[PDB]
Design an enzyme around this catalytic site. Structure first.
Site, PDB file in Angstrom:
ATOM      1  N   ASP A   1      20.387   0.790  -4.936  1.00 34.90           N
ATOM      2  CA  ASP A   1      19.790  -0.286  -4.140  1.00 34.90           C
ATOM      3  C   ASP A   1      20.521  -1.591  -4.478  1.00 34.90           C
ATOM      4  O   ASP A   1      20.699  -1.917  -5.649  1.00 34.90           O
ATOM      5  CB  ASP A   1      18.295  -0.423  -4.463  1.00 34.90           C
ATOM      6  CG  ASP A   1      17.411   0.584  -3.697  1.00 34.90           C
ATOM      7  OD1 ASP A   1      17.642   0.797  -2.486  1.00 34.90           O
ATOM      8  OD2 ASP A   1      16.465   1.143  -4.303  1.00 34.90           O
ATOM      9  N   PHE A   2      20.961  -2.332  -3.465  1.00 36.46           N
ATOM     10  CA  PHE A   2      21.733  -3.562  -3.693  1.00 36.46           C
ATOM     11  C   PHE A   2      20.884  -4.734  -4.202  1.00 36.46           C
ATOM     12  O   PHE A   2      19.744  -4.910  -3.774  1.00 36.46           O
ATOM     13  CB  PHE A   2      22.471  -3.966  -2.415  1.00 36.46           C
ATOM     14  CG  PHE A   2      23.277  -5.228  -2.544  1.00 36.46           C
ATOM     15  CD1 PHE A   2      24.509  -5.218  -3.164  1.00 36.46           C
ATOM     16  CD2 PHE A   2      22.808  -6.428  -2.006  1.00 36.46           C
ATOM     17  CE1 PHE A   2      25.265  -6.391  -3.262  1.00 36.46           C
ATOM     18  CE2 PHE A   2      23.558  -7.609  -2.095  1.00 36.46           C
ATOM     19  CZ  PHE A   2      24.782  -7.591  -2.724  1.00 36.46           C
TER      20      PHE A   2
ATOM     21  N   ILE B   1      32.835  -5.968  -4.959  1.00 40.25           N
ATOM     22  CA  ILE B   1      32.111  -6.965  -5.734  1.00 40.25           C
ATOM     23  C   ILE B   1      32.329  -6.719  -7.219  1.00 40.25           C
ATOM     24  O   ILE B   1      31.492  -7.075  -8.052  1.00 40.25           O
ATOM     25  CB  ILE B   1      30.606  -6.985  -5.397  1.00 40.25           C
ATOM     26  CG1 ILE B   1      29.953  -5.651  -5.754  1.00 40.25           C
ATOM     27  CG2 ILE B   1      30.401  -7.299  -3.925  1.00 40.25           C
ATOM     28  CD1 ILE B   1      28.509  -5.532  -5.292  1.00 40.25           C
TER      29      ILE B   1
ATOM     30  N   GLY C   1      35.982   2.904 -12.177  1.00 42.74           N
ATOM     31  CA  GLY C   1      36.435   2.628 -10.820  1.00 42.74           C
ATOM     32  C   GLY C   1      35.837   1.352 -10.226  1.00 42.74           C
ATOM     33  O   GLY C   1      35.227   0.555 -10.939  1.00 42.74           O
ATOM     34  N   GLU C   2      35.998   1.161  -8.916  1.00 41.87           N
ATOM     35  CA  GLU C   2      35.592  -0.080  -8.260  1.00 41.87           C
ATOM     36  C   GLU C   2      34.124  -0.132  -7.812  1.00 41.87           C
ATOM     37  O   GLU C   2      33.474   0.897  -7.643  1.00 41.87           O
ATOM     38  CB  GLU C   2      36.513  -0.372  -7.078  1.00 41.87           C
ATOM     39  CG  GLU C   2      37.939  -0.700  -7.491  1.00 41.87           C
ATOM     40  CD  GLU C   2      38.704  -1.459  -6.420  1.00 41.87           C
ATOM     41  OE1 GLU C   2      38.963  -0.876  -5.345  1.00 41.87           O
ATOM     42  OE2 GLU C   2      39.056  -2.636  -6.662  1.00 41.87           O
ATOM     43  N   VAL C   3      33.611  -1.346  -7.629  1.00 40.76           N
ATOM     44  CA  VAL C   3      32.246  -1.552  -7.159  1.00 40.76           C
ATOM     45  C   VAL C   3      32.223  -2.187  -5.764  1.00 40.76           C
ATOM     46  O   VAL C   3      32.810  -3.249  -5.556  1.00 40.76           O
ATOM     47  CB  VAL C   3      31.458  -2.453  -8.122  1.00 40.76           C
ATOM     48  CG1 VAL C   3      29.969  -2.407  -7.793  1.00 40.76           C
ATOM     49  CG2 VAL C   3      31.694  -2.017  -9.544  1.00 40.76           C
TER      50      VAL C   3
ATOM     51  N   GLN D   1      34.890  -4.250 -10.388  1.00 42.90           N
ATOM     52  CA  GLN D   1      35.502  -2.982 -10.782  1.00 42.90           C
ATOM     53  C   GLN D   1      34.907  -2.487 -12.096  1.00 42.90           C
ATOM     54  O   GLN D   1      35.256  -2.985 -13.171  1.00 42.90           O
ATOM     55  CB  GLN D   1      37.020  -3.104 -10.927  1.00 42.90           C
ATOM     56  CG  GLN D   1      37.623  -1.939 -11.698  1.00 42.90           C
ATOM     57  CD  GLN D   1      38.922  -1.453 -11.100  1.00 42.90           C
ATOM     58  OE1 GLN D   1      39.670  -2.225 -10.494  1.00 42.90           O
ATOM     59  NE2 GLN D   1      39.199  -0.164 -11.263  1.00 42.90           N
TER      60      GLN D   1
ATOM     61  N   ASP E   1      22.731  -2.975 -24.137  1.00 43.01           N
ATOM     62  CA  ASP E   1      23.632  -3.946 -23.555  1.00 43.01           C
ATOM     63  C   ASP E   1      22.857  -5.099 -22.904  1.00 43.01           C
ATOM     64  O   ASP E   1      23.227  -5.600 -21.843  1.00 43.01           O
ATOM     65  CB  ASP E   1      24.593  -3.276 -22.572  1.00 43.01           C
ATOM     66  CG  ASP E   1      25.851  -4.105 -22.325  1.00 43.01           C
ATOM     67  OD1 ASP E   1      26.163  -4.994 -23.154  1.00 43.01           O
ATOM     68  OD2 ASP E   1      26.520  -3.868 -21.297  1.00 43.01           O
TER      69      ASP E   1
ATOM     70  N   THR F   1      33.449   0.582 -14.989  1.00 44.68           N
ATOM     71  CA  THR F   1      34.078   1.305 -16.096  1.00 44.68           C
ATOM     72  C   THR F   1      34.957   2.471 -15.641  1.00 44.68           C
ATOM     73  O   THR F   1      35.923   2.828 -16.316  1.00 44.68           O
ATOM     74  CB  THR F   1      33.023   1.839 -17.096  1.00 44.68           C
ATOM     75  OG1 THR F   1      32.195   0.760 -17.541  1.00 44.68           O
ATOM     76  CG2 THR F   1      33.699   2.487 -18.306  1.00 44.68           C
TER      77      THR F   1
END
Lengths: 292, 255
Positions: free
Chosen positions: A83-84, A18, A24-26, A20, A128, A22
């Site tokens: 937690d998603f 879902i 690596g990937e998410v 990528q 941010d 800072t």
């Protein structure tokens, strides 16, 4: 080599990328035993990234209903496990089918400001603030997310001015301030609040100068009269149109008054989360209501 | 901090049954290995120009690391540099990898000379450190936020108006308790802080006056703390201090 306190990420089952991040990937993933959905964010020349250490340290400190929750860190590489969360304010707002009532917008701003009050109370600046960094859970709980640029603060500080996305960046930073505090996050709260009606970032500059110009065309012009001592580092005739330019979208007097008090030029005259929470906008009808 | 709250506090029996013990390292040897790592951290830290706080943090890392790993598998002389490298990053005084490696080497091999920064043997020691930092992060389960006794001493010795002398002697006690003991693995920092203030007072013949309420000073620092425990712990700390050549000299009133 024994490792009691760092579990292998294999405990989670990768369902779908879902993004990528800072480092690596998410991934969206599923706990193999309970089905609990989580987000896995993967983590150069100087060993383990000092930037990731900082974020982890901050995520471990911040425990609050309106702040994203780091569950644990997993090995294999390294992954931050959260937690998603299905939605994000930027997404919901860029969706014409999605519709907020005045009552829910109130609730959203309440949770957001409550998150800010908490992180600041804990000596953290988020740095941010933007719609896409505000998450909303399937159950309508707002979470401040993405602390990768966040930083602890204290009390002549020289913090980095390379902070905050341009459209959300406060005047102070654009004028080169390095001794800034919680007011920068609140300016961002302002831009987001206004975005709840305009469905789009109110001030979309292309360079710092364009941003500073845009800000003047909305909040009046930077004046040592308006902002005591500002002349220590533009347009000249601009006059405050915050309530006029947003008058269209917002309509509700209280909402407009609060946004006006958020998008204040002098960081020191800008309302804080505590007073903002106290503002009549959260204490008049229709009172704040839950999300669904 | 990734916790929970008593994960990194151990009973004396847990200290006896350490990972190193499992591989045949005597208790006394293990205490020595800890003291040597702390000394190496202090030597390196001073040369790298990091703060005592950063050194202290690295010392707790080391102490905790060896409640999980064995000295027989990871030598102090390897863990210290990685621990310090990590702690300098965590404490906001980042030192470069080449820099820590260079200083580690001169501390460990004063008469040798650093390999060529182009050699495979040097490229490898740079990688060995990185790998060890990663093993440390995972052993500590990424709990890197350390509370030190010094924080609580400072508070107290001011809120009781102690001479600079007394406060300085207390900070000294706090720092040496990291080098010389495993208190950081057994007692909370506010407790350790009470131990240090107590001994400093005894050493300086100072008495902190009972509060108007009838509360002893330490009751304002930690509610669990008792005079019995304080006297037991000060005696332990004093004993290791007496066994450390030149250490007491630093606080000895020579007048």
């Amino acid at each position: 080599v024994e490792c009691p306190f760092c579990d292998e990420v294999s405990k989670y089952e990768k369902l779908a990328k879902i993004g990528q991040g800072t480092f690596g990937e998410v991934f969206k993933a599923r706990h193999r035993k309970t089905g609990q959905k989580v987000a896995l964010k993967k983590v150069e020349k100087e060993g383990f990234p000092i930037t990731a250490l900082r974020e982890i340290k901050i995520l471990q400190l911040l425990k609050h209903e309106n702040v994203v929750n780091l569950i644990e860190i997993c090995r294999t590489s390294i992954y931050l496990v959260f937690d998603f969360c299905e939605h994000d304010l930027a997404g919901l707002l860029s969706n014409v089918l999605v519709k907020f009532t005045l009552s829910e917008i109130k609730r959203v701003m309440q949770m957001l400001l409550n998150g800010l009050y908490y992180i600041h109370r804990n000596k953290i600046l988020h740095r941010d603030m933007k719609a896409a960094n505000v998450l909303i859970t399937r159950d309508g709980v707002l979470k401040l997310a993405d602390f990768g640029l966040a930083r602890a603060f204290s009390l002549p500080n020289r913090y980095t001015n390379r902070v905050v996305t341009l459209w959300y960046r406060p005047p102070e930073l654009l004028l080169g301030e390095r001794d800034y505090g919680p007011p920068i996050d609140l300016w961002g709260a302002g831009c987001i609040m206004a975005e709840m009606w305009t469905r789009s970032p109110i001030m979309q500059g292309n360079t710092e100068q364009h941003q500073l110009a845009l800000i003047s065309q909305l909040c009046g012009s930077i004046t040592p009269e308006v902002w005591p001592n500002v002349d220590n580092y533009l347009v000249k005739g601009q006059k405050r149109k915050v309530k006029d330019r947003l008058k269209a979208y917002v309509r509700d007097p209280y909402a407009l008054d609060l946004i006006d008090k958020l998008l204040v030029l002098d960081p020191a005259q800008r309302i804080d989360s505590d007073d903002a929470l106290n503002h009549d906008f959260f204490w008049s009808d229709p009172m704040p209501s839950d999300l669904k | 901090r990734k916790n929970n709250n008593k994960r990194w506090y151990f009973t004396r029996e847990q200290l006896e049954n350490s990972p190193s013990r499992r591989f045949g390292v005597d208790p006394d040897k293990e205490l020595s290995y800890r003291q040597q790592a702390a000394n190496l951290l202090q030597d390196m830290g001073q040369r790298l120009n990091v703060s005592q706080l950063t050194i202290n943090t690295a010392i707790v890392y080391m102490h905790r690391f060896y409640m999980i790993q064995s000295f027989t598998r990871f030598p102090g002389n390897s863990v210290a540099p990685a621990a310090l490298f990590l702690a300098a990053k965590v404490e906001g005084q980042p030192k470069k990898l080449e820099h820590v490696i260079k200083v580690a080497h001169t501390c460990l091999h004063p008469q040798e000379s650093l390999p060529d920064t182009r050699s495979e043997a040097y490229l490898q020691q740079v990688q060995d450190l990185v790998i060890l930092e990663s093993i440390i992060l995972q052993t500590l389960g990424f709990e890197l936020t350390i509370d030190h006794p010094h924080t609580h001493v400072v508070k107290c010795t001011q809120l009781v108006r102690a001479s600079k002398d007394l406060a300085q002697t207390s900070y000294f006690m706090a720092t040496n308790s990291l080098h010389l003991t495993t208190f950081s693995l057994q007692y909370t920092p506010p407790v350790v802080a009470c131990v240090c203030i107590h001994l400093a007072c005894k050493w300086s013949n100072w008495e902190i006056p009972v509060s108007t309420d009838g509360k002893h000073w330490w009751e304002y620092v930690d509610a669990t703390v008792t005079l019995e425990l304080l006297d037991e712990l000060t005696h332990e700390l004093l004993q290791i201090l007496e066994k450390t050549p030149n250490r007491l000299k630093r606080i000895w009133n020579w007048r």
